[PDB]
Amino acid sequence: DLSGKMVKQVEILSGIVFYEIFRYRLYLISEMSPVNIQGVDLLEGNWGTVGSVIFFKYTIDGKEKTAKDIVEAIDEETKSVTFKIVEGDLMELYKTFIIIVQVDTEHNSVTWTFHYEKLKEDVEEPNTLMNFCIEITKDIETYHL
Ligand SMILES: [Cl-]
Ligand SMILES: [Cl-]
Ligand SMILES: [Mg+2]
Ligand SMILES: [Mg+2]
Numbered sequence: 001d002l003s004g005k006m007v008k009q010v011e012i013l014s015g016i017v018f019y020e021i022f023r024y025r026l027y028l029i030s031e032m033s034p035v036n037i038q039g040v041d042l043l044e045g046n047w048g049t050v051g052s053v054i055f056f057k058y059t060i061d062g063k064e065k066t067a068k069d070i071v072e073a074i075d076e077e078t079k080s081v082t083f084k085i086v087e088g089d090l091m092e093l094y095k096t097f098i099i100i101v102q103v104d105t106e107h108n109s110v111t112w113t114f115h116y117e118k119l120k121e122d123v124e125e126p127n128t129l130m131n132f133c134i135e136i137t138k139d140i141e142t143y144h145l
Contacts, residue, residue, distance in 0.1 A: 001121055002095075006114040006130050010137045015108035018140060019079040022101050024048035033139035035059065036132060043068070050074050056088075060132050065089040072098070079103040093123045099133075110137055 012018065021028050024047050027040045038057040045052030049071065056067045067088035074081050080102040090097050100113040112133045114126055 002118045004114075004116050004118065004125060006126065007111065008130055008134060009109050009111045010134055011107065011109045012137065012141045013108075015079070015103045015105035015110070018108075018110055018137075019081075019103040019105065021140060022081050022103075023074065023079075026054060029136060029140070032143040033136045036136055036139070038064075045071075048074075053086075054083075058132075061128060063089075069099075075102075079105055090126075090129075093119060094126075095119050097126075112137075 021032075026047065027042075030037045030040050036058060038059065039055070041055045041057075043053040043055050050073065052071045054069050054071070056069065058065050058067070065088065067085050067090060069083040069085050072082045072084045080100060083099045083101075085091065085094075085097040085099070094116045096115075096117040098115040100111075100115075102111045102113070103109070104111070112130065114130065116126065
């Protein structure tokens with residue numbers, strides 16, 4: 001009863017840019033979605049490499065939050081990257097939290113997948129976080145048109 005999954009596919013305008021940002025230039029989101037994301041700071045490793053550790057300062061529902069994530073997996077062929085949250089506000093609610101971003105690069109799309117284990121049964125499904133990811137996606141696609 002503690003495990004959960006969420007999946008949302010977002011159609012976008014057209015995808016190499018998106019996977020460039022989430023693999024190699026994640027620091028760009030602070031510029032593209034500056035209300036939501038205050039800071040993206042590499043802590044260990046290189047941008048775009050498995051096992052790199054990234055710190056995020058962000059605002060959700062009017063609350064300032066932080067997360068530290070490790071890039072647990074990359075698939076260059078399917079344009080996918082898997083983040084594991086290891087520290088931060090979300091760890092007060094979830095024992096494990098994994099976010100998979102995958103970009104289909106004609107008509108392109110971004111699929112967000114969350115896999116998580118709640119600490120306790122009464123913890124909410126992370127709908128708010130999913131809405132946040134969707135917002136970031138729309139901000140990327142509409143940046144400096
Ligand atoms: Cl690598
Ligand atoms: Cl992956
Ligand atoms: Mg894989
Ligand atoms: Mg913990």
